[PDB]
Design a protein around this ligand. Sequence first.
Ligand SMILES: [Cu+2]
Length: 235
Amino acid sequence: HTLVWGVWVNGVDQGDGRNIYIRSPPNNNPVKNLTSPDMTCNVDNRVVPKSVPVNAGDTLTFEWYHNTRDDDIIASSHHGPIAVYIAPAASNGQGNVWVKLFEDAYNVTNSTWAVDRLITAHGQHSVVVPHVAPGDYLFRAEIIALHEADSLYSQNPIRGAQFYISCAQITINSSDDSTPLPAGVPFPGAYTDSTPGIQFNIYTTPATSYVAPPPSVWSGALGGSIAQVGDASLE
Ligand SMILES: [Cu+2]
């Protein structure tokens, strides 16, 4: 149970974004139904009044929280991967539009899931803004909690993979468009009951065997991190 509070651009806090530049849902409950319209941008997908200006190559950091800013972030039970996708804003997230910029699942070097590292990072994970066409975009940050993912939601609706999905409105101003955005995958649609990484038993299956759901990270993606970029307590 987690939500995005706001974003930072090159380590500069853009301020509380909830219902302002984040398409915030009414609460921190997960989406679990893979065919739900809620898979696009969570349960309250609508245009919010602000879009955060960035340039290609900027570091864009998403900041998550549980109940209040810079708290426990997410229950430590909620092990799983983190992904970030981008789509042009005119799509409203509909159709074959979502391109994956970032994936982090289980780190064999560190023996830690991405969610474990997100807690250590006070809720902060980042991407490099790609060199796509200037204009308005949606950045869809997705945490998958796998603590009840041994079942499919479609077999037992009390269980299943939990999707914490947050869509930020970002305007890319300066960009040479050296990597034009291609067509992508649809949400809902990309993840099905047979997709690798959706049904996974963390109690019985070693995390070293986990394969995150496709699609693969786009060849235009410039990377990212799970790391604290800004100190919310200094405000
Ligand atoms: Cu939860």
